[PDB]
Amino acid sequence: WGNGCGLFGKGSIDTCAKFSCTSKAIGRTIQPENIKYEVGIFVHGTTTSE
């Protein structure tokens, strides 16, 4: 009877808080045709350290 109501032992409330995202991660999905491969190929001839 002290707080807000004339009954005892129970109650009901709805607590709402606006959501705010400070930071978010992002994922990616890989398409098969989009995949590229850079393949270095070399044959040994006359060479230097350079």
Partner 1 sequence: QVQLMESGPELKKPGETVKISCTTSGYTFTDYAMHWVKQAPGKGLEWMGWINTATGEPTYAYDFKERFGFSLETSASTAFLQISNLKIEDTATYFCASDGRYWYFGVWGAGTSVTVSSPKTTPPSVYPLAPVCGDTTGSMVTLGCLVKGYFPEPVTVTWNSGSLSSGVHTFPAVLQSDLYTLSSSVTVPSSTWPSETVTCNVAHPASSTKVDKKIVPR
Whether 3 and 10 have beta carbons less than 8 Å apart is answered as no
- Is the CB of 5 or the CB of 16 nearer to partner 1? 5
Q: Does residue 13 interact with partner 1 by CB under 8 A?
A: no
Considering only 3-11, 13-21, 26-34, 39-47, which stretch makes contact with partner 1 by CB under 8 A? 3-11
- Residue 6 C-beta: closest distance to partner 1, Å: 4
The gap between the terminal CA atoms of the chain, to the nearest Å, is 91
Compute the C-alpha angle 17/20/21, nearest 5°.
140
Judged by the rule CB under 8 A, the positions of this chain that interact with partner 1 are 5-7
